[PDB]
């Protein structure tokens, strides 16, 4: 695989998001996804309801702002038969009724690809296919300060993770430790946060905060 990748060059990505005071971060990392790949498609690059996956796709099993998962809502956007754009149901960080509206359905999937539980494995999907999404651990303050470099947080866990975050490419840089490679990471904690809203995870560190734990993307 290349030693480097970044999909944001490409086209791919849309700008950095902001979840709020809603544990919605799978409904942003699945429109991350969705968006990277409708546009391999298309070569159009739309921004993505998050508020339609947090509204509607309870009965793939998603909880709202009380939690869910990237695979079920590329479910949902299967079953359903489309997704609605940003700008035509625009996110609201709390929970309501579902309001989509197949006129305003701007992307499909016909399901999704879970990807080996292997950084090997996440790297040749990242530098074949586009953004994936990825669960990590993330409840560490080390986290919510992260400011620049290589994220590393010995007490991270590689199996329970609690945040979904989107992987746009790898990269390396040379540090004090000489543990150079890293993931560039899409959060949807806003700007502020991290390196204008990314953060730059440990790779091939015995797959740390479990970002090769759960990785999947749609199939568009
Ligand atoms: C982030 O905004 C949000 C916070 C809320 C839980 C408050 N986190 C999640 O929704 C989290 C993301 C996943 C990818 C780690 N989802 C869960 O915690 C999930 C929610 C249920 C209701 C679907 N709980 C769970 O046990 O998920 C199973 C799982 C976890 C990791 C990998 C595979 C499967």
Same mark, same amino acid.
């Given at each position: 695989a290349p030693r480097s990748v970044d999909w944001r060059e490409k086209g791919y990505v849309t700008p950095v998001k902001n979840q709020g005071q809603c544990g919605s971060c799978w409904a942003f990392s699945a429109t991350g996804a969705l968006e990277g790949q409708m546009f391999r498609k298309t070569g159009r690059l739309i921004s993505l309801s998050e508020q339609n996956l947090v509204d509607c796709s309870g009965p793939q099993g998603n909880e709202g702002c009380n939690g869910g998962l990237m695979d079920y809502a590329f479910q949902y956007v299967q079953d359903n038969g489309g997704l609605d754009s940003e700008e035509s149901y625009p996110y609201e960080a709390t929970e309501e009724s579902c309001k989509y509206n197949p006129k305003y359905s701007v992307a499909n999937d016909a399901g999704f690809v879970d990807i080996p539980k292997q950084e090997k494995a996440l790297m040749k999907a990242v530098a074949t296919v586009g953004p994936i999404s990825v669960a990590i651990?993330? $409840?560490?303050e080390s986290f919510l300060f992260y400011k620049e470099g290589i994220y590393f947080e010995?007490?991270?866990?590689?199996?329970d993770m609690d945040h979904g975050v989107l992987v746009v490419g790898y990269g390396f840089e040379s540090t004090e430790s000489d543990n150079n490679k890293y993931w560039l990471v899409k959060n949807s904690?806003?700007?502020?946060? $991290?390196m204008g809203g990314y953060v730059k995870m440990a790779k091939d560190r015995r797959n740390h905060c479990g970002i090769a734990s759960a990785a999947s993307y749609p199939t568009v």
């Open positions: 651990d993330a $409840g560490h010995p007490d991270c866990s590689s199996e904690w806003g700007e502020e946060w $991290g």
